């Protein structure tokens, strides 16, 4: 029973103590559901935290660290109980243990603590976790351990309210520059996921990522053999090209567009949807970037997805087309018309998602407005495919911005 175990772990007899802490560890590491609340309420936490000081019994330290690791894996209240019992400074101590498995378990427990949220992360950071953590990254570290280190790095990078301090980001980026050349898939996946978390934090963090020099190593992972790697990288570069035109061009200069035919035609619709969302952010760029997308022969693939894709992919392709009309030359828009964009574009006028409808009406209006003299020909094509009837029906929509734009388009 729990009473016996709690009483026994604070013992003078080294074998009963080890046995009792081992029993507690095993209680937390077996079934799909462990008794975490009963162990928290039993009072065992101070015994386990005390066990972390026992440099004379690395087996006891490992077992106690593992128990605490698994307690910290539960809800925020359970993780905070581990934190409130003063475990964090003791785990930071065990990062300098000569015993590898003890060190790895200390890393793992700290990973679970860091993962709970931004304030917990920032506490662990303020106590100095990052340098001893990144010091493990070396050619000789065993791979199971290196993987656990990289998972902790992901948890240092992923919370955004606030993001990790700039100085912490500055320490992690050189390590990611090292790890992105690893051949192990799980390490590569985590490294790239970390980059995707840094690149979603804002334009200054995007710039730091660019300045590390890693983007030319990141872009080619879009064609990696493992799909988990491809989609992590697709997220990371997609976030970079949400930045300025200058920032977007860094990604394009890495030949990013050469990787997209295999993403636009991928069997998995989620990959199609991500890739079209990337391209919509390229076509929102300057005229030279628009031309880069045209010249990569991606517009026909986009229009096909506009016509026959899943609704999420259709919505992003609608944005990519409309954004193309906003910041595009007359001749680039003419290329769109020649590729028969108009019918599949107008077919989205009837969907129940008003945001997509607004985007489409805006793009149709801009298309007609930019072709100063050819406006009659373009109006006739819109009529031919039923677009006029669709606009007339959109005059009765609930949404004022929609019905206003439909009236304005028909009048103008």
């Amino acid at each position: 029973s729990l009473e016996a175990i709690v009483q026994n772990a604070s013992s003078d007899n080294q074998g009963i103590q080890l046995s009792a802490v081992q029993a507690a560890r095993k209680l937390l590491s077996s079934d799909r559901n462990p008794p975490i609340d009963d162990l928290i309420k039993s009072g065992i936490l101070p015994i386990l935290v005390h066990c972390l000081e026992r440099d004379d019994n690395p087996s006891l330290q490992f077992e106690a660290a593992w128990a605490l690791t698994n307690i910290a894996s539960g809800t925020s209240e359970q993780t905070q109980a581990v934190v409130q019992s003063n475990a964090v400074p003791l785990f930071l101590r065990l990062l300098h243990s000569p015993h590898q498995n003890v060190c790895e378990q200390a890393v793992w427990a700290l990973g679970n603590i860091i993962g709970d949220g931004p304030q917990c992360r920032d506490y662990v950071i303020s106590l100095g976790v990052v340098k001893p953590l990144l010091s493990f990254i070396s050619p000789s570290i065993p791979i199971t351990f290196l993987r656990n280190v990289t998972w902790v790095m992901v948890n240092l990078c992923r919370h955004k309210d606030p993001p990790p301090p700039m100085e912490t980001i500055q320490e992690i980026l050189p390590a990611l520059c090292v790890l992105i050349h690893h051949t192990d898939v799980n390490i590569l996946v985590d490294t790239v996921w970390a980059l995707s978390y840094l690149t979603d934090a804002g334009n200054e963090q995007i710039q730091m990522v660019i300045d590390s020099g890693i983007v030319p190593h990141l872009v080619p992972l879009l064609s990696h053999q493992e799909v988990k790697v491809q989609t992590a990288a697709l997220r990371a570069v997609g976030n970079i090209v949400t930045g300025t035109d200058e920032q977007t061009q860094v990604v394009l200069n890495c030949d990013a567009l050469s990787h997209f035919p295999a993403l636009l035609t991928h069997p998995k619709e989620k990959i199609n949807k991500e890739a079209v969302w990337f391209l919509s952010n390229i076509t929102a760029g300057n005229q030279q970037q628009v031309q880069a997308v045209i010249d990569a022969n991606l517009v026909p693939m986009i229009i096909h997805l506009l016509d026959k894709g899943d609704f999420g992919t259709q919505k992003e392709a609608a944005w990519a087309i409309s954004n193309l009309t906003i910041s595009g030359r007359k001749d680039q828009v003419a290329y769109l018309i020649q590729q028969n964009v108009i019918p599949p574009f107008c077919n989205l006028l009837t969907v129940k998602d008003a945001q997509v409808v607004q985007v489409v009406l805006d793009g149709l209006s801009n298309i007609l407005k930019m072709a100063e003299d050819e406006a009659e020909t373009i109006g006739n094509l819109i009529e031919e495919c039923g677009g006029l009837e669709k606009i007339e029906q959109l005059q009765n929509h609930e949404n004022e911005d929609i019905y206003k734009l439909a009236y304005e388009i028909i009048d103008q």
Partner: peptide, 21 residues
Amino acid sequence: RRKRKREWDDDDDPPKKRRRL
């Protein structure tokens, strides 16, 4: 003209907490 940030789930994220077995 402007860029957008994604409006979907991204349910493939790596685990925040991991319980060792």
